Amino acid sequence: KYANYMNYLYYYQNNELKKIDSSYFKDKYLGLFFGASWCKYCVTFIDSLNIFKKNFPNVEIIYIPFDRTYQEYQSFLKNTNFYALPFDNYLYICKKYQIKNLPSFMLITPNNNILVKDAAQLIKTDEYINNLKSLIKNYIIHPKTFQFNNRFFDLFRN
């Protein structure tokens, strides 16, 4: 089906929609944020993510959108400055990870393994930072090379 899959991610900076090569995310921790602008609990969760991001600045937050319209998606990216997948239908990613509801937030290690599947519920406990720092401190990352340095077919497709 895909000759090249997920070549680019996107973000808003200085009022402008920008692209970033998906190879930028090789070898990084990621936080996959499954959300939508029309979901009140997703909008509230942004405040939890912002606190998370300050404490874990090297984890790259990626918005996986479930907006109904491109305009909704754009206003969400503008307000959060997160990186995001292009606007599209990502139900297949929900199916792969058996995501039950929005918001969800998964912490992924550099080789695409799941470090914390339930991280949206974890960060809502507001008692988690030291424990998570230690979890990451104690996790031995194993490198993994991906074709074209693009990790996302492995992460999102089967």
Residue numbers in the entry: 22 to 179
What does the study report here?
The structure reveals that plasmoredoxin, unique for malarial parasites, forms a new subgroup of thioredoxin-like proteins together with tryparedoxin, unique for kinetoplastids.
The five independent PfPlrx structures determined in the monoclinic (four monomers) and hexagonal (one monomer) crystal form are essentially similar. All structures are in the reduced form, with an equal distance (3.8 ​Å) between the Sγ-atoms of the active site cysteines (C60, C63). Furthermore, the N-terminal helix α1 is missing in the hexagonal structure.
